[PDB]
Structure 1
Amino acid sequence: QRRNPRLVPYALLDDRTKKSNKDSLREAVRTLLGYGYNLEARFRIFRAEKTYAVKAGRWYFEFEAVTAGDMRVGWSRPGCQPDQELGSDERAFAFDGFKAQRWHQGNEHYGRSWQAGDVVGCMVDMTEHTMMFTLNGEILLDDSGSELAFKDFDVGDGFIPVCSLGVAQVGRMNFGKDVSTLKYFTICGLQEGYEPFAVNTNRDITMWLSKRLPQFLQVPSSHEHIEVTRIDVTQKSFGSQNSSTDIMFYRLSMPIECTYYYSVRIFPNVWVGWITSDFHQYDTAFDLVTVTLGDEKGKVHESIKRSNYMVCANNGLEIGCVVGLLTFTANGKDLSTYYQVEPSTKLFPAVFAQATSPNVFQFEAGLFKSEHKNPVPQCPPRLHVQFLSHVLWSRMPNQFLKVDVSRISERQGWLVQCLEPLQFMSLHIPEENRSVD
């Protein structure tokens, strides 16, 4: 019911004319107990640049606690990873502002919880191997009658001011330069033999928050059980038996622009496709180009493309043959889902998969490795040391874009306007295409 002006759910519409329906059963309840029937009822990491990692002296900065939840503030070694979460190893030396404890390979109580609108403060001795915090001007104490919170560490490559946030929290960190906004420095600090980060700098210290979008990386020796074995046709083996092996999206490095095919070998649920140079879709599912024609009047408006992430599913030798355009073979069967549309795009060889068995995937009418490098007679195929077997990993940190835009906003017509052009300095790796400044 057409042109209905109330086409919204329960969450927003006028329930006061529905309060005649609400209070109808608020007074009809009095006909029940008068009768005798009653009723009874993600986590982001924030850190400074590794080149500021001071390895000597007595240092201090503060944190303002604004809202409720995850407030973890501390100092960590430069090898701390934002792929994981804070504290759960020997690297991070942090204090839990909520739940009244401190994180270094575990949990043990320290101090209290924050308040809304706080200033925490954290102080680190680097010459001496102690580390004493504070809170709102008050030094924080342990259960064992000690303000000397973190002791007996190892002085390696210094310690960077780190942090962590949760789901709906707002944070405020001050690395010096703002002595007028030092709310508890005058009682603790200079009178305790310490220093802020205001001691020398003339620049604004760059922050390295973690990155939401997963973009892939080299396959290291860093997994419990992931080991591509480079073998000499000229496959790439595997093994992935662990306790947590849900989904890893694999891909090779080098793409094909716009004649040869490409073979896998699997026993069983396991996909085979092609990745275009933007694939940062992490999902344990199946999901996603589709733009039409335009012929100055319409009248055809059919399609452009098919590719946007190509789909397949004793030996499953499912094969992505290329050019021309794209098709698929499967153990000899030229199956359906011809993805034969690509104008001038670059396509990564790709495998998206789970892990059930070890020694499970492989790789490679002649064969393939001509079409990448510059020499292209190259009918004998040959593997190369530049061929890597990347794994899509989650969170590698980003820079902070120290000056942004001098925009202004209006309402009477909503004028939004900037007039100060800033510029990058962007370099893009040509063969693993992505733009870094």
Structure 2
Amino acid sequence: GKWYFEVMVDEVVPFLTAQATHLRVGWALTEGYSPYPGGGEGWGGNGVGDDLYSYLHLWTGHVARPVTSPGQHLLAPEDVVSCCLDLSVPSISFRINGCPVQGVFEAFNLDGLFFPVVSFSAGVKVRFLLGPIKEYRREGPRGPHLVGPSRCPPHLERIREKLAENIHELWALTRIPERNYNLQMSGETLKTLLALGTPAQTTLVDRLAENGHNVWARDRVAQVPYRLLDEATKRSNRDSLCQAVRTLLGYGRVRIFRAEKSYTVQSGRWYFEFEAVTTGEMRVPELRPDVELGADELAYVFNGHRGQRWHLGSEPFGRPWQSGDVVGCMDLTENTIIFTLNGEVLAFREIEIGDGFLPVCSLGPGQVGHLNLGQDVSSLRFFAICGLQEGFEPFAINMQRPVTTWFSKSLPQFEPVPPEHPHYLAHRTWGSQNSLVEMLFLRLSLPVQFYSVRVFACVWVGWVTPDYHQHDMNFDLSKVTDLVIGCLVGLMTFTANGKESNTFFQVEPNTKLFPAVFVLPTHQNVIQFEAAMFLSERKNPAPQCPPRLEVQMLMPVSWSRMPNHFLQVETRRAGERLGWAVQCQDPLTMMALHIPEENRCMDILELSERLDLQRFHSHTLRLYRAVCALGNN
């Protein structure tokens, strides 16, 4: 219900680099915060969320807001934020040093667990005061691991009764209207047996106990699932159930990791070794960053556990995968994908060629391992003899700099799409129909700063924020054939259901509303789009009375596409609790530049990976150089 805690921050120099460090506290539910070191929208932060609630001036939606305090300054080595949150009526609200520093929260939702998040920018150390945030990249003894991602009849009755009294007495001996109460308890047991209608029976009994235990817990609360309660309790419950049983007898999701395209190998024989810091089943240019893994024309792999490799298809050829077990895969010149297990060699016969390929490693939730990579030290297991016999040399000397691999990531973006899904004035509206699932969503490509819609064809519509993109999901309105268009100089609505809903919500300070909606299901799409104010907005030129059509149109979905590559270091200090204060040292600088889309974090490496963006950037650079020409001031 109520919870409160205190964390005191240690000695952070506010400036190294031209940055005012990061070190904002707030709180957050699991869902919808999924930090990345790539950095979010608007050039990435905390309190960005409609998740994050963090705390200075304001944080919320990634839109700082001023706040009354008495220190009226940023946290520094001196202080102790003094955190508080109620859940019940849910308000986080805050103090520092017991000093009121104003009221905030309420009006969002229950769901998930709203823990405390601490952000450190630079060199800083802090105590937390009580008595990872996900992560593809791990943490390893030799070569970083890499793991994730984890979501976490009457006669019978008489027999029962008489048997029950005996049981109560037997139980009584061990301890050293009452039974009676014992008989009533036996009767309950009978009800449980009726509900139930070999070890599985024992498990069922334990489950029933938890369920009854659960009702008991509810009663106590009025005054956690049994797996949740814990193993010792479960074991104790199991024993009683077992005694009862003797008496009865008597009575009679997946993350894919990729390599840079530049590394690409188009010829020869090479070897890649995968290291497992995780035990489980995993599969080892064209393949999509995001999509089904291991069952496609794009690549060939088999689950370690299964002793099966997707052709894509079904096959055996191997011992079941063992945690912390060496694996070895081996040629451009021939055409095989030999698999050496522990080397300890197990391959594929006759394979197409060109466009290189490399092998892609995708890890499903909860196992980490590290896959390598460079140096002789690297041959491990090994996994060395084969290289010696194989002559399929490791990347070795080439790629002296450490290799970099793009990451699938977590959050979809409302990207452009063309001819996809097959089967994907005005007119504007279109869509593709096949055996299309819902969906919807839609989105648009015009930005408003700080006037018509047609459709018809039931479906939620609203207008989406620049940061509106978020995981979808069922998306039933609202979670945080008449078409009415609302124009904002104001209140945005339109004429709901053809005829007025009235006016629902509006912000007039200077945000910036993006229009689409999401439409889902049906044999025929029947969607029609379009513009006065909208036309004026879209073009710097105008507004003009005549309707205008953009060179560009927008779409198509956030998608669930993974493509951002990871980085160089991300070392800090962790951050040990017991003592209660964690200190982080060093500095990180991001060369990435924000788009006018806008606010996405570019990641320079990402730009390098994407040529079209790169081409545009290069052209821009040339133009800039050109303006400079002639030595003009």
The bucket for the TM-score relative to the shorter chain is: 0.7 to 0.9
Amino acid paired to 1:12? L
Amino acid paired to 1:376? A
Cα distance change, pair 376–341 in 1 and its aligned pair in 2 (3 A): same
Looking at structure 2, the residues matched to 281 and 428 of structure 1 have their Cα atoms a distance apart, in angstroms, of: 22
Q: How does 1:38-57 map to 2 (within 5 A)?
A: 42-57=253-268
Looking at structure 2, the residues matched to 436 and 270 of structure 1 have their Cα atoms a distance apart, in angstroms, of: 33
Secondary structure at the aligned position of 1:351 is classed as: coil
Aligned residues of 1:319 and 1:328 also touching (Cα < 8 A): yes
Amino acid paired to 1:423? T
Amino acid paired to 2:568? K
Measured against aligned partners, the alpha-carbon deviations of 1:345-395 in whole angstroms (never above 9, x if no partner) come to: 121112112121324212119452111221233221101112323322112
What is the CA distance between 1:55 and its match in structure 2? 0.8
* More divergent stretch after superposition (95-104 vs 416-425): 95-104
What is the CA distance between 1:256 and its match in structure 2? 0.4
Looking at structure 2, the residues matched to 31 and 95 of structure 1 have their Cα atoms a distance apart, in angstroms, of: 48
What is the CA distance between 1:108 and its match in structure 2? 2.7
Aligned to 1:416: 582
Aligned to 1:407: 573
Looking at structure 2, the residues matched to 105 and 378 of structure 1 have their Cα atoms a distance apart, in angstroms, of: 56
Amino acid paired to 1:136? N
Aligned to 2:535: 369
Secondary structure at the aligned position of 1:417 is classed as: strand
Looking at structure 1, the residues matched to 511 and 437 of structure 2 have their Cα atoms a distance apart, in angstroms, of: 32
Q: How does 1:23-62 map to 2 (within 5 A)?
A: 33-34=249-250, 36-37=251-252, 42-62=253-273
Aligned to 1:293: none
1:12 correspondence with 2:12:
no
Q: Does 1 or 2 have the higher relative contact order (CA < 8 Å, sep 6+)?
A: 1
Looking at structure 2, the residues matched to 179 and 33 of structure 1 have their Cα atoms a distance apart, in angstroms, of: 62
Aligned residues of 1:254 and 1:431 also touching (Cα < 8 A): no
Measured against aligned partners, the alpha-carbon deviations of 1:126-175 in whole angstroms (never above 9, x if no partner) come to: 122222110011111xxxxxxxx223222221112311222222222011
Aligned to 1:104: 311
Aligned to 1:177: 375
Aligned to 1:89: 296
Aligned to 1:136: 342
Cα distance change, pair 177–345 in 1 and its aligned pair in 2 (3 A): farther
Which of 272, 275, 278 aligns to 1:64? It is 275
Secondary structure at the aligned position of 1:369 is classed as: helix
TM-score (ref. length: structure 1) = 0.78
* More divergent stretch after superposition (46-55 vs 406-415): 406-415
Looking at structure 1, the residues matched to 486 and 368 of structure 2 have their Cα atoms a distance apart, in angstroms, of: 47
Q: How does 1:116-135 map to 2 (within 5 A)?
A: 116-123=323-330, 125-135=331-341
1:242 correspondence with 2:434:
yes
Looking at structure 2, the residues matched to 423 and 205 of structure 1 have their Cα atoms a distance apart, in angstroms, of: 20
Aligned to 1:276: 465
Measured against aligned partners, the alpha-carbon deviations of 1:65-96 in whole angstroms (never above 9, x if no partner) come to: 444433110xxxx1101321123221113243
* More divergent stretch after superposition (351-360 vs 43-52): 351-360
Aligned to 2:25: none
Aligned residues of 1:93 and 1:150 also touching (Cα < 8 A): no
Secondary structure at the aligned position of 1:191 is classed as: helix
Which of 593, 597, 604 aligns to 1:431? It is 597
Amino acid paired to 2:461? V
What is the CA distance between 1:329 and its match in structure 2? 1.8
* More divergent stretch after superposition (392-401 vs 364-373): 364-373
Aligned residues of 1:118 and 1:136 also touching (Cα < 8 A): yes
Amino acid paired to 2:365? V
Which of 517, 521, 526 aligns to 1:351? It is 517
Cα distance change, pair 25–411 in 1 and its aligned pair in 2 (3 A): closer
Looking at structure 2, the residues matched to 376 and 189 of structure 1 have their Cα atoms a distance apart, in angstroms, of: 67
Looking at structure 1, the residues matched to 532 and 324 of structure 2 have their Cα atoms a distance apart, in angstroms, of: 69
Secondary structure at the aligned position of 2:262 is classed as: helix
Coordinate RMSD, CA, aligned:
2.9
Aligned residues of 1:72 and 1:98 also touching (Cα < 8 A): no
Q: How does 1:251-262 map to 2 (within 5 A)?
A: 251-258=443-450, 261-262=451-452
Looking at structure 1, the residues matched to 558 and 325 of structure 2 have their Cα atoms a distance apart, in angstroms, of: 39
Amino acid paired to 1:221? P
Aligned to 2:406: 208
More helix by share: 2
Aligned to 2:553: 387
Secondary structure at the aligned position of 1:368 is classed as: helix
Amino acid paired to 1:90? E
What is the CA distance between 1:342 and its match in structure 2? 4.6
- The unaligned stretches of length 5 or more in structure 2 are 1-216, 604-633
* More divergent stretch after superposition (329-338 vs 390-399): 329-338
Secondary structure at the aligned position of 1:354 is classed as: coil
Amino acid paired to 2:448? I
Aligned to 2:355: 157
Secondary structure at the aligned position of 1:319 is classed as: coil
What is the CA distance between 1:401 and its match in structure 2? 2.0
What is the CA distance between 1:337 and its match in structure 2? 5.4
Measured against aligned partners, the alpha-carbon deviations of 1:224-253 in whole angstroms (never above 9, x if no partner) come to: 212xxxxxx122232433224221311111
Aligned to 2:206: none
What is the CA distance between 1:411 and its match in structure 2? 3.3
Aligned to 1:80: 287
What is the CA distance between 1:206 and its match in structure 2? 0.8
TM-score (ref. length: structure 2) = 0.55
* More divergent stretch after superposition (54-63 vs 81-90): 81-90
Measured against aligned partners, the alpha-carbon deviations of 1:29-69 in whole angstroms (never above 9, x if no partner) come to: 666555x24xxxx1111111111011111100111244443
Aligned to 1:166: 364
Secondary structure at the aligned position of 2:565 is classed as: coil
Secondary structure at the aligned position of 2:389 is classed as: coil
Looking at structure 2, the residues matched to 24 and 422 of structure 1 have their Cα atoms a distance apart, in angstroms, of: 58
Looking at structure 2, the residues matched to 151 and 178 of structure 1 have their Cα atoms a distance apart, in angstroms, of: 29
Cα distance change, pair 263–191 in 1 and its aligned pair in 2 (3 A): same
* More divergent stretch after superposition (352-361 vs 406-415): 406-415
Measured against aligned partners, the alpha-carbon deviations of 1:85-134 in whole angstroms (never above 9, x if no partner) come to: 123221113243232222223223222222221011111x0122222110
Looking at structure 2, the residues matched to 111 and 27 of structure 1 have their Cα atoms a distance apart, in angstroms, of: 44
More strand by share: 1
Looking at structure 2, the residues matched to 338 and 47 of structure 1 have their Cα atoms a distance apart, in angstroms, of: 46
Secondary structure at the aligned position of 2:464 is classed as: strand
Looking at structure 1, the residues matched to 552 and 532 of structure 2 have their Cα atoms a distance apart, in angstroms, of: 21
Amino acid paired to 1:286? D
What is the CA distance between 1:432 and its match in structure 2? 3.8
Aligned to 1:222: 420
Secondary structure at the aligned position of 1:265 is classed as: coil
Cα distance change, pair 338–152 in 1 and its aligned pair in 2 (3 A): same
* More divergent stretch after superposition (323-332 vs 401-410): 323-332
Aligned residues of 1:255 and 1:432 also touching (Cα < 8 A): no
1:186 correspondence with 2:384:
yes
Looking at structure 2, the residues matched to 131 and 30 of structure 1 have their Cα atoms a distance apart, in angstroms, of: 56
Aligned to 1:295: none
- The unaligned stretches of length 5 or more in structure 1 are 141-148, 227-232, 289-307, 310-314
Measured against aligned partners, the alpha-carbon deviations of 1:198-221 in whole angstroms (never above 9, x if no partner) come to: 232221111122121111211212
